[PDB]
Structure formats: structure tokens, C-alpha cells
Amino acid sequence: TVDQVEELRRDLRIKSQELEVKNAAANDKLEYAVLISEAQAIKADLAAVEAKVNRST
């Protein structure tokens, strides 16, 4: 379970980097609605991952 927690944290920070990169891409593209939807989906996945991490902690 501890190993699973660490894997969840690593996936959380990797997806955080991905969300920041996609948000920068959307800001550059401000061809925009699709990027907005992708960023919102990544943010929702990050929120679910953070909820799982909080439950694990």
C-alpha cells in the first residue's frame, strides 16, 4: 500500500507537469476549445488522483 501511495504521488506530479504544459499550450493558442476541453479533463483527472492520494494518506 505504501508503494502504491508513492506511485500515486509520482503519477500526480507527472500529470501536474502535463497539466501545466497543456495550459501553457492553451494560453499560446488563445484550435482553442479542444485544448480547453483537454486541459479540463486533465484537471479533473488530477483532482481525482489528489482525492485518491488524500484517502491513501
d(CA 30, CA 33): 9
Contact 56, 5 (CB under 8 A): yes
CA-CA distance, 5 to 39, in Å (whole number)? Answer: 25
Q: Is 38 exposed, middle or buried (CB count within 10 Å of its CB: 0-12, 13-18, 19+)? A: middle
Grid coordinates standing for 34? 479542444
**Structural resolution in Å:** 3.1
Elucidated via: cryo-EM
Residue with cell 484550435: 31
Which residues are CB-contacts of 46 (< 8 A; sequence separation ≥ 6)? 12, 15, 16, 19
Closest CA to 21 of 43, 47, 2: 43
Compute φ and ψ for 32, nearest 5 degrees.
Answer: -125, -35
